[PDB]
Structure 1
Amino acid sequence: FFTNMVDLFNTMVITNGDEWLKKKGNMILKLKDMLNLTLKTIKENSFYIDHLQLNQSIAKFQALYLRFTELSERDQNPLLLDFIDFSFSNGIKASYSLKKFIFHNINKEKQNNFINDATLFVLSDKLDARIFVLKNVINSTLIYEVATSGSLKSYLVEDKKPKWLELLHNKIWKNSNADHHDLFRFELLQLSAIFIKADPEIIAEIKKDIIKFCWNFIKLEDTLIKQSAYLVTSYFISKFDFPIKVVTQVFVALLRSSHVEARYLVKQSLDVLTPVLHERMNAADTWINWVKRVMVENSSSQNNILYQFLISHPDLFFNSRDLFISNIIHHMNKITFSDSHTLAIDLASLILYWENKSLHLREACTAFLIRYVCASELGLRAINILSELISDVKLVYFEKFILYYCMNALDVLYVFFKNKTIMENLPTIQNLLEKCIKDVQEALQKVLQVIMKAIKAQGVSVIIESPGKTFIQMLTSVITQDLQETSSVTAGVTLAWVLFMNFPDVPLLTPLMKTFSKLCKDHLSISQPKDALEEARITTKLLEKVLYILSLKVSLLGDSRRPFLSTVALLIDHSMDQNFLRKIVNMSRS
């Protein structure tokens, strides 16, 4: 009967428009008690408790009362009473009320009338949830006013009382006993978040008095709130004027981290202070020395180091004890022995920034960058800034350094490409390159392409000149002729193409006439279906595409140019090569 009448009311409420009590609803009182009276007998009985038969009907009157709340105009009293009746049993937390609050929030002095009513209602402490949800409304009201304005301007442009400061100085003086769900801390964080909101306002010393109560909150320390009050302090400190002894101690408080790291605040507190103290350091360095002792007092904390990574951007702009920081950094490089690398990348860049505007440690820095690759990004590019820094362990301490060989293939390539900027070193490097002859060959093609940029001369044509070219090229032919070295042939072709890019001279062409022959064999092997999975075609596409590209490119389609077009007809038998022959005509048309 508790349910069935309510829909019997609701179906009548459905039919009637204003209401069938015409937006007055004395039975709404007779029901709202009856539900608590249903909640009364609910405490006696246990048949089908927490029934949806209740719970849906429980939503229904909740929907109904919220509808009348929108329908009525008394925009103070049912707000608490519903929150009271919802604190009474089975807390709904109506998103519709959150929507109606969003409908209520987004000057209406009805909001200001609610605002002192809010100052009343949450101070009307009598449950905790009733007080808590009020604060949830209150902070959201506080936030949306200042957020959806220039700066809180419905209140900031003459809120027609210090109704806040009536409540605020009352609260700031109170601090009463500094709530199972950290509701005090929730009320504190609400008090904190409200005070964070009003910190851009017109209260200077009363806020500095309110921040003094926040120092009592900073005196309060349970771990979340402790950093939070530390976070609360910094936003005051960026805003308000700061004593230097308070400035160092807060930086000392910044030096005191914890377990569940409020680094987000700590970076933000750094984002407060690293302007302010450095501007004050610009306005004047004793704080950094006290910091350096504190930095010494890190006790293995790399949280200090990542904080110091931000702090080194003023500090390398300061540029006081750079190698001392770097000597710490190598001991920190020893400590991680990819987070430290970025810190090392920043610290290298910081050291690079001052010196552009020891090298052995920079050489040891490259040793860690290689060792970071060998125990497996930016670190290639960080070696390239290190390349521009070390050209502002020599080359030979990696005779043993698969993936390690390939990573060193990339590394020695950038090592060679940078240190090139030679004519004896490169065959001596080719002596090392002939030694380390263990795709990685595609990376070796990139190294050869780096060697090809070195093979560019600009005034060295028949000046002494090509043993390194010939020894590779026969080794390109010999590796090709064995078995399955198609990409290796192509690399040797790309070598020969680089050699043709280097030289106007047939001995390449005779394996190359053998190559497009063997590719034509490989074409008919690959066009044995008239359509494998993906790779060997597209390679031999690009393999023959390069193989086509050179054999025409100079001149003089050979004496077996008759064998040359015989592949081309079998190519026309295949179904591909749209642009490729289209270019290949165009030069032959030329």
Structure 2
Amino acid sequence: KGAPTALTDMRKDIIKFSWNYIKLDDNTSKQAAYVVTAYFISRFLTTRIFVALLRCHQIDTRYLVKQALELLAPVLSERWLKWPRRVLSETQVANIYQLIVKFPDLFYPARDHFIPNIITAMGKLTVLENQQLAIDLAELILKWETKLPFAQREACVTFLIRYICISELGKRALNILYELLGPVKLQFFERFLLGYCLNALEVLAVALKTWIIENVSYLQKLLEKCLQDIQEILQKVLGIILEAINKEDEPEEVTNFISLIVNIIGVAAGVSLCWTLSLYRPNALDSLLPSIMRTFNKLCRDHIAEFEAKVTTNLLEKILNLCAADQRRVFLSLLAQLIDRS
């Protein structure tokens, strides 16, 4: 690694030292001659090394074998991949193969038909610390989609959505799932806790990247069975609901049902729902009349002192004061009481 210009006659019998130490008997100093021969091949007959590096090994040389392949692969294409394909006919011995079709994939997109079968084996491996390797294999399926570019690709996204439904890294996988959908799902949302809200979060993400109006009528039945994390999911749901309202009578019923949910809150999630409702809809003053009575009891509890809820209620009172401009006398009196408070 440091002195390739030392000599060349000593380079002739490196193999007389290194390949002699292949025939040892342990499992660590046998492997350590596979790595020191991978630095020498990667400078300037090389078939027998990398056909045995990916062979059936125990879980002892996990970090040991992987460093011997990553330093070998950029000279391998210089000197084809049937031997990686031949070991797929014979699990735990796949992850050594998977990590070399993970990093240097500039040439890997040649026969990707086995990569689709490996993507089918990726979901079989998804069913643990290898889940991070499976998410890396899930990112490899997005990478192979970025390397190759069928109907199995939509089926692979269905297993990836089920992998997200089985659950950080999944948020990055859901962002990768959003990019893959842009490049049965409503029935999967109807079939499915917090991951089902995340499945509802990905359903609105797939809806973004008319027909959305009739789907909102089905989603109104979905939102009726649903209405913190539920408030965060409804915040993404109201952004999908108001996007179709930005461009009929079904939208008035969904606004009235959420106003009934705002009446059911009168707890803080309805104020969070009303802030999202007033974010892109002009007329909400009818629900704001009982909400001002609820915010007056909320300001009385806030003045007696849930700091995030009181700040949101103050933001709700900030939104209600812009909308009110006939309880302006009682609202200004509580505002002066809040101004006189600590």
Q: What's the TM-score once normalised by structure 2's chain length? A: 0.86
Aligned to 1:322: 112
What are the within-5 Å matches in structure 2 for residues 169-248 of structure 1?
200-239=4-43, 241=44, 243=45, 247-248=46-47
Offset, 1:319: 1.5
Aligned to 2:50: 251
The verdict on how the C-alpha distance between 1:205 and 1:346 changes in structure 2, with shifts beyond 3 A counting, is farther
- Partner residue in 2 for 1:550: 319
Could you say which residue in structure 2 is the equivalent of 1:425? 215
Deviations 1:381-434 (A, max 9, x none): 323322232232331124352xxx222212212221332341221222222222
Give, in whole Å, the separation in 2 of the partners of 1:224 and 1:439.
Answer: 52
Hey, what does 1:366 align to over in structure 2? 160
Instruction: Confirm whether residue 349 of structure 1 aligns to residue 142 of structure 2.
Output: yes
d(CA) in 2 for partners of 1:504, 1:410: 30
- Paired position in structure 1 for 2:239: 450
Alpha-carbon distance in structure 2 between the residues aligned to 1:367 and 1:433: 21
1:504-515 matches, within 5 Å, as: 504=283, 506-515=285-294
Q: Is the 8 A contact 1:274 1:314 kept in 2?
A: yes
**CA shift for structure 1 position 467:** 2.4
Q: Which residue of 2 aligns with 1:267?
A: 66
Contact 1:274–1:311 at 8 Å: present in 2 too?
Answer: no
Residue in structure 2 matched with residue 497 of structure 1 by the alignment:
278
1:323-342 to 2 correspondence within 5 Å? 323-337=113-127, 338-342=131-135
Question: Which segments of 5 or more consecutive residues in structure 1 lack a partner in the other structure?
Answer: 1-195, 281-286, 528-535, 576-590
The answer for unaligned runs of 5 or more in structure 2 is none
Length, aligned pairs only: 335
Alignment of 1:390-539 (within 5 A): 390-401=181-192, 405-421=193-209, 422-434=212-224, 436-437=225-226, 439-452=228-241, 454-455=243-244, 457=246, 460=247, 466-481=251-266, 485=267, 487-498=268-279, 501-504=280-283, 506-524=285-303, 526-527=304-305, 536=306, 538-539=307-308
CA deviation vs aligned residue, 1:32-65 (integer Å, no higher than 9, x gap): xxxxxxxxxxxxxxxxxxxxxxxxxxxxxxxxxx
Work out the CA distance in 2 between the residues paired with 1:573 and 1:306. Answer: 68
Alpha-carbon offset, residue 311 of structure 1: 2.3
* Identity between Structure 1 and Structure 2 (%): 34
Supply the AA of the counterpart residue of 1:506: L
Between 310-319 and 214-223, report the one with greater CA deviation: 310-319
Shift of 1:548: 2.0
**CA 1:210–1:505: 2 relative to 1, 3 Å:** closer
Q: Give the Cα separation in 2 of the matches to 1:341 and 1:223.
A: 27
- AA matched with 2:285: V
Work out which of the two has the higher radius of gyration on C-alpha atoms and give 1 or 2.
Answer: 1
C-alpha separation in 2, matches of 1:508 and 1:293:
68
**Alignment match of 1:565 (pick from 318, 332, 335):** 332
Write the letter of the residue equivalent to 1:394. K
Once residues 385 and 274 of structure 1 are traced to their aligned partners in structure 2, the CA distance between those partners, rounded to angstroms, is 27
Corresponding residue for residue 180 of structure 2: 389
Residue type of the alignment partner of 2:278: W
2:185 counterpart SS class: coil
Cα deviation digits, residues 132-156 of structure 1 (max 9, x gap): xxxxxxxxxxxxxxxxxxxxxxxxx
Distance 1:432 1:279, change over 3 A: farther
- Measure how far apart 1:227 and its partner are: 0.4
Return the alpha-carbon distance in structure 1 between the equivalents of residues 231 and 147 of structure 2: 38
**In structure 1, C-alpha distance between the alignment counterparts of 2:5 and 2:62, rounded to whole Å:** 27
- Give 1:509 deviation, angstroms: 2.2
Q: Distance in 1 between matches of 2:236 and 2:74?
A: 46
TM-score using structure 1 length: 0.52
Q: Which has the higher contact order (CA 8 A, sep 6+)?
A: 2
Q: Are 2:194 and 2:229, in contact at CA under 8 Å, matched by a contact in 1?
A: yes
